[PDB]
Structure 1
């Protein structure tokens, strides 16, 4: 089952974390982790600050790097370098309503591509992505070349966006404390 083949990954922030703010009593990042854990057996967090907090919830923490690369791609590569699965489902810390069929729908719609990411009907969410580790070398080469754009990389790897326009407000992102108040229950 996908549950035992894809490693879930909370992208908590590369070199505070707004993901620590509570939504309905639970920190934003833990909404994401809990949603991934309902669908996937093995779930880790990519974090470079507050490691003890993430770890304290029973999750393994993967710290970045080797080289101090910038942005989300750097965390993705760090996780592939430090974890053995074939497949990873990444999600940032601030999208607490991700749907219960995230992994299944992304996988079903992959069309044999090594990477896919969510399009919510309005925009792309390239860091909510199902990634095969076969693109580890390409990612390393991309970052070594000084490149940083997420979607450009994912397209260059042969990926595409998957339509989640029917999953209402599942991909809302909590940008600030103020937005968080529009969502408190």
Structure 2
């Protein structure tokens, strides 16, 4: 019964027994992933999180936690696909767990600027953020096909799928990434 599902991408792999769980690093006392989930819930009713480590911690805030298929596909697209395979509904707005300042018109502006494309993503004036992306259902089989072929490249997929960047360069700093604990310490 809603148009777009919000999805926090809180990562996969655990390639050495994890290391740092980025989504759980705390900014002003609140996990980065929750900053992102709260920003999505401002604009969307149904928000879920894709997480593959420490799932019980993610589950504590009461959102649905979606794990990756045992297929173990590489990179951010694997989590997008896992979520589409486990959630109904025609549209998904993905956002990595490390961009805590995303704005309340994210979904609105991406939707306004879609212009018939099945995927659009954010361009912040300086770079693409291809995993901050509004993605139609119809992308699911193409993603499955891409991943089964052993591919991983996100931008390449986004181009193959026929998407385009949407210009959010006027939103100063809403798309800053908090990539490491060292970076995080600067935003407290």
| TM-score normalised over the length of structure 2 | 0.94
Q: Which 4+ residue blocks in structure 1 deviate beyond 6 angstroms?
A: none
Q: CA deviation at 1:179?
A: 1.0
Could you give the per-residue CA deviations for residues 84-131 of structure 1, whole angstroms, max 9, x where no partner exists?
010000000000000010000011111110000000000000000000
Q: 2:6 aligns with which of 5, 8, 23?
A: 8
The more displaced of 11-20 and 104-113 is: 11-20
| Contact kept in structure 1, 2:25 and 2:32, CA below 8 Å | yes
Could you give the per-residue CA deviations for residues 42-98 of structure 1, whole angstroms, max 9, x where no partner exists?
111011111111111010011102411011100000000010010000000000000
The aligned counterpart of 1:22 is: 26
Secondary structure of 2:10 counterpart: strand
| TM-score normalised over the length of structure 1 | 0.96
Number of residue equivalences: 182
The alignment yields a C-alpha RMSD, in angstroms, of 1.1
Q: Gapped runs of 5+ residues in structure 1?
A: none
The aligned counterpart of 1:97 is: 101
Q: CA deviation at 1:4?
A: 2.7
Q: Gapped runs of 5+ residues in structure 2?
A: 14-19
Distance across 2 between alignment mates of 1:141 and 1:59 = 29
Distance across 1 between alignment mates of 2:2 and 2:144 = 26
Secondary structure of 2:186 counterpart: helix
Distance across 1 between alignment mates of 2:56 and 2:70 = 21
